[PDB]
Amino acid sequence: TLRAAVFDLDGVLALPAVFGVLGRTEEALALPRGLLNDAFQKGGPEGATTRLMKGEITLSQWIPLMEENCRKCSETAKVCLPKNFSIKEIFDKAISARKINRPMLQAALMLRKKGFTTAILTNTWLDDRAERDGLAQLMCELKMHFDFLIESCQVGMVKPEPQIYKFLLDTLKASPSEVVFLDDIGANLKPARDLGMVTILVQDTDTALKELEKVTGIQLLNTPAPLPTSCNPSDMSHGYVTVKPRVRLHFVELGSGPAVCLCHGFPESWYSWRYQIPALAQAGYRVLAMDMKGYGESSAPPEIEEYCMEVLCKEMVTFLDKLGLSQAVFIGHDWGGMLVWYMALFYPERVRAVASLNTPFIPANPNMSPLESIKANPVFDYQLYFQEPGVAEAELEQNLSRTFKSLFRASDESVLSMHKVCEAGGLFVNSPEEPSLSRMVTEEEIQFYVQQFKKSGFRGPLNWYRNMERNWKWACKSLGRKILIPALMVTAEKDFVLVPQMSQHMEDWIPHLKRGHIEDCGHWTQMDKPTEVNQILIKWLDSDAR
Amino acid sequence: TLRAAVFDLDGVLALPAVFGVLGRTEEALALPRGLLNDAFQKGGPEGATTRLMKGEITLSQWIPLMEENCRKCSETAKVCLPKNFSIKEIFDKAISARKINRPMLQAALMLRKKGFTTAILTNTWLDDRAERDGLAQLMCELKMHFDFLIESCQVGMVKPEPQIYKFLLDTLKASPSEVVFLDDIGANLKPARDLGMVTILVQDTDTALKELEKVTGIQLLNTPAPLPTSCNPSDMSHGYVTVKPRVRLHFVELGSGPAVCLCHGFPESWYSWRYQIPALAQAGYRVLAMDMKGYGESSAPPEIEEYCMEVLCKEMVTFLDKLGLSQAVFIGHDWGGMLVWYMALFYPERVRAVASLNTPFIPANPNMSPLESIKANPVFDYQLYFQEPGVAEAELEQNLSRTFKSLFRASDESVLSMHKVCEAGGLFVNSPEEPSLSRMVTEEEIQFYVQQFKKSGFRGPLNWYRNMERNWKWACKSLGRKILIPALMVTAEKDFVLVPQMSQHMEDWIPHLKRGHIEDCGHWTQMDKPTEVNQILIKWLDSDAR
Ligand SMILES: Cc1ccc2c(c1)SCC(=O)N2
Ligand SMILES: Cc1ccc2c(c1)SCC(=O)N2
């Protein structure tokens, strides 16, 4: 019975194969068929290419050796190589054109999700070319999805030498009959078969995956669309910045490029952005996913006034100062979305661009008390229930697992009616003791939130709602301003509190506002519709924040 | 007696003043004298500029109001504004041309170093222009050097209104006679004087500083060249990455731009790069200053083999993987310098560029044992003393303050002769019990190293020297390679162990090697000659790593 799957890189996990560009070049330049492929393999196990593949020499040292082999091959074939013939140019173009074979990667992801140990076994080189970063990026993206990456140039062994196969088996800690081995080179497949491994000769991906699903008994072809890559908290880089004597802010950091600061809502975590963090980093951004003040590993002082927007915004500016960032793009959801609009209004020089999920920008009404304003909308009743210190803390902290399971539900699963909460005497008074698990979350993800909230509970988080008057007075100072930096508003069709229509007048304050809209999406945008959030945010970042 | 100094931004800490470009524009366009300056101040306290300076409106909203004022002023003066007249272009150019007034900043730094509370008090605006990042960067650099930054647009008060002066005094927690106030606008200086503050009208910097040093009694002009900005550990962003189950790596992070990974030597810390971190970040780089394995907040497993180059390099690759970085420029010193050459040889695709301070690249000799090789050079005797587990730990851990004070000394201060250490029976056997403090370090900096080493001591650090055979076998695999990625070798004239001549054959292995050389510099390069290290590294990064 199979428990391990091994994939080659060239022509398997990455296409078009770098091999076959030698063939493609021969055709375009009308060179004798196989001339370049022959110069490539010249000298066989003692040749320059084997030395390269074993890590004896680097790719830049190999280039002139390949050029000498091409000359010797053309001389024997009694032909001439063109005037501007360059091995470097040919290989630069082939490497740059080779991209991840997405359905092969998805199949490897599914097998690993089912308990398989997965590995990449590849004949590759030490890349010291000026354009090596492209291949470094491809390898980084691919490797994270596998248990092991075995590279010929690092192990000093090459396929089809029998030793690399014994080395593979030793690293997998598996007997050969327990292994599926996928390769596009028949000669490299032979020693694995000889050892008793299941082998698949990959020509076209679909046929290879049909063979792969038949032998494993796992559906790999025609599957439902997978969710984006999530985060394993223990595999993240965790950052900590003291913004003032008693306040430290924690964040998770991934990627390179323009800084993108993600600001969660209530009662959430940096982890609410788990589906966005890998996607935004892969899109070419340096992601900083915060634990907002009062949450997770960030400090949670008890005083109400520590959570007014003016103080929270000043602390986020200090956070940027201490990290040495002149700007960040700020993306927020729920309370985080309110904070990001205030960052845009009060600190535009520090905000590269601003985006909000669900939370609209509604200017303060200077002729009405914020308390009156909340009372005017029945769906805001939960905010009145949150006012009295201790009442909501008691209900939310009583049973953490029940709190998160009752809250984190898709539009067609909810049991919480945020209107008439005060009258009912609680958020969960008509909710079960043991809620069913929403299709949006796993038991493990719920337990992560439970563990995070065991540190500080709900006082700090609820305090975000307890500064209405203070926030109103501060917001009134901005009533003559417009938001003129790049801005995105993302509405969720089925958020029954932060309804899309509440955003209808935003263009009066943000004339250049761009929009996104997610159908069949509830309040928990990031986890409800992660694929669609990622598509909207990446498209907007690439056009407006780059 | 004075205890606080307050500086204006425009025309004081930053030059040329944005004011006076209105005058400069009038002259270049042959407009009536003062036309632009009049449109700028139109309506006085009720005018558009005061509204801008109080934060009522943003700079982008103010631009067309200034354009309307210019039209009204030209109409009254019976003149016409040119065809391509643009307030936006004029202000973009003026803001971009304004740079920090370095001697004014140095004077503020010296006063603060002497116990003064320093502040910037400025009439400024909320900048939402597409090019706002330039001013955001300038403000970030300046603000870090002061106790307070008071901006008119954030406080809703403007100079010369008497309220902003009372607000200044309240924030300084000082009586007016205790305050020096420097401004380039005489009208803005008047309320401070009226309150009893010492005031200086800044026209040219030299005269202003003569006035400033006369009134404070502190030398500010003609001073010795200051050291670069250092790091306060508690003000840094601290990052933590688990690279394998029992190993976490700690780093300090500052700046945006290409990742630059700094790798310290023995027995050091991320803090040994304290003078480089702010300078490299200000130069446009994202600095990652490591605590190498075995040090500070990084894990220190006891096993010797956890510290061989192959494992240390694999862990640094995993560190990059977990942070989502396809590459970093690697800069190392002493053992860190040896590691960075090995990163360049084994993982060129992950190394953007490589630089070493003091440590030369010497290929492994496959015909001589590494033990024999160390024995051949008398200055390497300390490495033999470090071999026996427990001997050097006992001597180095006996008195931490004595260890760091004996080690960290300039070339003209040393008491340690690294030849005949085994014979003498120790590194400090002819060193005092209470060494004098080197001119390179403060007591506080020594105590930081003492506190860091209290966690794990010297086992992990000494283990870096205990893998000679393992490192030799691994290095022999790279004997057919050349380092062909961008590389810099920095020699220190007076390092008597890592002598400059030991680097003489490096071009045979690194043909495109660039060099730097520091005269009158001992082993502790970064702290011995920080200004010169910063100049060499920034020049090289900007030409070879950008
Ligand atoms: C805290 C919170 C705020 C708004 C919400 C929810 C929860 S779920 C129900 C919903 O649609 N909106
Ligand atoms: C650990 C260490 C290595 C080399 C050194 C020193 C210290 S100080 C004396 C010197 O010049 N070289």
UniProtKB/Swiss-Prot annotation, chains A, B:
Phosphate binds at residues 122-123. GO terms for cellular component: cytosol; extracellular exosome; peroxisomal matrix; peroxisome. Its EC number is 3.3.2.10, 3.1.3.76. Its main location: cytoplasm. It holds the Pfam family Abhydrolase_1. Residues 1-223 are annotated as: Phosphatase. The modification Phosphoserine is found at residue 369. Mg(2+) binds at residues 8, 10, 184. The active site is at residues 334, 465, 523. A lipid is attached at residue 521 (S-(15-deoxy-Delta12,14-prostaglandin J2-9-yl)cysteine). The keyword Phosphoprotein applies. The modification N6-succinyllysine is found at residues 54, 420, 454. Inhibited by 1-(1-acetylpiperidin-4-yl)-3-(4-(trifl uoromethoxy)phenyl)urea (TPAU), 1-cyclohexyl-3-dodecylurea (CDU), 12-(3-adamantan-1-yl-ureido)-dodecanoic acid (AUDA), 1-((3S, 5S, 7S)-adamantan-1-yl)-3-(5-(2-(2-ethoxyethoxy) ethoxy)pentyl)urea (AEPU), N-adamantyl-N[']-cyclohexyl urea (ACU), 4-(((1S, 4S)-4-(3-((3S, 5S, 7S)-adamantan-1-yl) ureido)cyclohexyl)oxy)benzoic acid (c-AUCB), 4-(((1R, 4R)-4-(3-((3S, 5S, 7S)-adamantan-1-yl)ureido)cyclohexyl)oxy)benzoic acid (t-AUCB), 4-(((1R, 4R)-4-(3-(4(trifluoromethoxy)phenyl)ureido)cyclohexyl)oxy)benzoic acid (t-TAUCB) and to a lesser extent by 8-(3-((3S, 5S, 7S)-adamantan-1-yl)ureido) octanoic acid (AUOA). One of its GO terms (molecular function) is 10-hydroxy-9-(phosphonooxy)octadecanoate phosphatase activity. Substrate binds at residue 382. Bifunctional enzyme. The C-terminal domain has epoxide hydrolase activity and acts on epoxides (alkene oxides, oxiranes) and arene oxides. Plays a role in xenobiotic metabolism by degrading potentially toxic epoxides. Also determines steady-state levels of physiological mediators. Belongs to the AB hydrolase superfamily. Epoxide hydrolase family. The N-terminal domain has phosphatase activity. The C-terminal domain has epoxide hydrolase activity. PANTHER family: EPOXIDE HYDROLASE. Homodimer. This is Bifunctional epoxide hydrolase 2. It comes from Homo sapiens (Human).
